[PDB]
């Protein structure tokens, strides 16, 4: 039962900060982190990680601690 973590666009956050957080928390390459950051900024949201419900719960928590707006939901 796959879940996803979604990050939502916040006016306040620096784009450079969002990119860094995605690299720090998920270990993503710089280009992919930027890709996701840009999707959040341009589309308003983006799926930033996927896996077990338990894994997504922690990803959400980590993101919240970093100051980003994160939610999770079961994948279709
Ligand atoms: Co913006
Ligand atoms: Co723009
Ligand atoms: Co749990
Ligand atoms: Co919270
Ligand atoms: Co809090
Ligand atoms: Co809070």
The domain that contains 25 carries what CATH number? 3.30.1390.10
Q: Is residue 76 part of a domain?
A: no
Task: State this model's resolution in angstroms.
Answer: 2.0
Method used to obtain the model = X-ray
Q: What are the contacts of 39-47 at 24+ separation with CB within 8 A?
A: 40/7, 40/8, 40/9, 41/9, 41/15, 44/8, 44/9, 45/6, 45/7, 45/8, 45/9, 46/6, 46/7, 47/4, 47/5, 47/6
**Closest to 8 (Cα-Cα) out of 34, 38, 33, 40:** 40
Q: 61 C-alpha to center of ligand 4: Å?
A: 7
Q: 67 C-alpha to center of ligand 5: Å?
A: 9
Please measure the distance between the N-terminal and C-terminal CA atoms of the chain and give it in whole angstroms.
Answer: 9
Q: Is residue 47 part of a domain?
A: yes
Decide if 23 contacts 30 (C-beta within 8 A): yes
Per DSSP, helices labelled H in 1-76 are: 15-26, 30-43, 53-66
Show the domain range for 11.
Answer: 3-71
**How many domains does one find in the chain?**
1
Q: Is residue 30 part of a domain?
A: yes
Q: 52 C-alpha to center of ligand 6: Å?
A: 23
């Amino acid at each position: 039962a796959p879940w996803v973590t979604i990050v939502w666009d916040d006016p306040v956050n620096l784009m450079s900060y969002v990119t860094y957080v995605f690299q720090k928390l998920f270990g993503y390459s710089e280009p992919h982190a930027t890709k996701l950051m840009l999707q959040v900024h341009n589309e308003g949201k983006a799926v930033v990680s996927a896996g077990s419900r338990e894994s997504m719960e922690v990803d959400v928590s980590k993101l919240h601690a970093a100051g980003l707006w994160a939610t999770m939901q079961q994948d279709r």
